[PDB]
Amino acid sequence: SRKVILTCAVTGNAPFNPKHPSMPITPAQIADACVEAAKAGASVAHIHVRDPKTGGGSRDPVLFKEVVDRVRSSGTDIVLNLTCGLGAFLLPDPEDESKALPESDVVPVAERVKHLEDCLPEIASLDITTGNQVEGKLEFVYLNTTRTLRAMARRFQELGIKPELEVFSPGDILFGKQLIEEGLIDGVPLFQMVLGVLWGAPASTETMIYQRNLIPANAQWAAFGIGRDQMPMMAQAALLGGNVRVGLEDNLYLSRGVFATNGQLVERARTVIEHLGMSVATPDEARDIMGLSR
């Protein structure tokens, strides 16, 4: 019985759908969601913050600090994974694509890592890719130069934070391996396949097997899907020796037309994993697997 690491991505930064009656928006709600996920058996909480007003995207370090302070004082333990995918948002000017439209948010390393400096989570997410992306109807470019990624990786090492290397393609996996080569990735490397995001690798078993075989043998890997692909990709990862992820960041629905809580999503995934003869890693078990000190 392998112990499967389960991460709950509690809110994300995709647009708030106010028909969802319990979407975590405020830092208190987001912390509450981490605790709820923990109590349902989650190993790790993946955390974004939202504009506490509008439910819109935010990268305010003050908000991150409040979330971490709340979870840490909750009386419930869970490994914290803070998003660091922020500040890579490029909108080329159609009149001259050499130029970034003002709504772009492409910011330097020092600013990108400010929240990490303040909060010191065990893990932070790093999207090790540049590419054409889509969020809903919104088309943009994710701009993470290998130069910037190298600098980020180095900062994480310095801060004692383990990156979760988020990959959208085999090419991305190769670059992750290059980071490792270059001495920029400490201990047990962590890779996660983002599946079914446009214009990245699709959510299929074939994709998962192919990409898995490119990942270093000494690394831990995970894979996840979005919406209706969330549960299938979770089971498929478990079956292939990977770790897993669920949460409202990736899927709002328990079933067709029925909104989920984070806890419910965790409970469902846990049930599947157990029924398949495995179990879900406690936070401390996950730390041990990942070589994180207790």
Closest to its own copies by CB, 53 vs 96, is 96
* Alpha-carbon gap, residue 62 to 208, rounded angstroms: 37
- Contact between 11 and its own copies (CB under 8 A)? no
Answer yes or no: are the C-beta atoms of 202 and 229 closer than 8 Å: no
- Buried/exposed 235-251: b ≥16 CB within 10 Å, e otherwise: ebbbeeebbbbbbbbbb
- Contact between 39 and its own copies (CB under 8 A)? no
Segment (H or E) for 17: none
Question: Taking CB within 5 to 8 Å according to partner kind, which of Ni ion, its own copies, none is near residue 110?
Answer: none
Residues in 119-148 that interact with its own copies by CB under 8 A: 129-132, 139, 141, 143-148
Q: Which stretch binds Ni ion (CB under 5 A): 37-45, 79-87, 147-155, 234-242?
A: 79-87
* Alpha-carbon gap, residue 100 to 104, rounded angstroms: 6
Q: Which stretch binds its own copies (CB under 8 A): 65-73, 103-111, 158-166, 184-192?
A: 103-111
Segment (H or E) for 109: helix 109-112
Work out how close the CB of 211 gets to its own copies at its nearest, in angstroms, rounded to a whole number: 9
- Contact between 114 and its own copies (CB under 8 A)? no
* Alpha-carbon gap, residue 131 to 200, rounded angstroms: 8
Closest to its own copies by CB, 183 vs 241, is 241
Closest to its own copies by CB, 91 vs 286, is 91
Neighbours of 205 (CB within 10 A): 12
Q: Which stretch binds Ni ion (CB under 5 A): 33-41, 76-84, 133-141, 193-201?
A: 76-84
Burial (Cβ within 10 Å: 0-12, 13-18, ≥19) of residue 203:
buried
| Identified binder of its own copies from the candidate list 28, 182, 210, 284, rule CB under 8 A | 210
| Identified binder of Ni ion from the candidate list 7, 11, 81, 83, rule CB under 5 A | 83
DSSP state of 250: T
| Identified binder of its own copies from the candidate list 43, 58, 119, 168, rule CB under 8 A | 168
Which of 180, 187, 100, 170 lies closest to 129 in space, CA to CA?
170
Name, in order, each residue with C-beta under 8 angstroms of 96's C-beta and a sequence gap of 6 or more. Answer: none
* Alpha-carbon gap, residue 231 to 249, rounded angstroms: 14
Q: Which residues pair with 133 in a beta bridge?
A: 140
Cis peptide preceding 199, ω within 30 of 0 = yes
Question: Taking CB within 5 to 8 Å according to partner kind, which of its own copies, Ni ion, none is near residue 239?
Answer: its own copies
Pairing of strands 92-93, 49-50: unpaired
User: How many residues sit in the footprint of its own copies (CB under 8 A)?
Assistant: 59
Q: Which stretch binds Ni ion (CB under 5 A): 81-89, 108-116, 210-218, 284-292?
A: 81-89
Closest to its own copies by CB, 120 vs 141, is 141
Enumerate binding residues for its own copies (CB under 8 A).
1, 90, 92, 94, 96-100, 104, 106, 108, 129-132, 139, 141, 143-148, 168-172, 174-175, 178, 198-202, 205-207, 209-210, 213-214, 228, 231-232, 235-236, 239-240, 255-256, 268, 271-272, 275-277
Contacts with Ni ion, residue ranges (CB under 5 A): 83
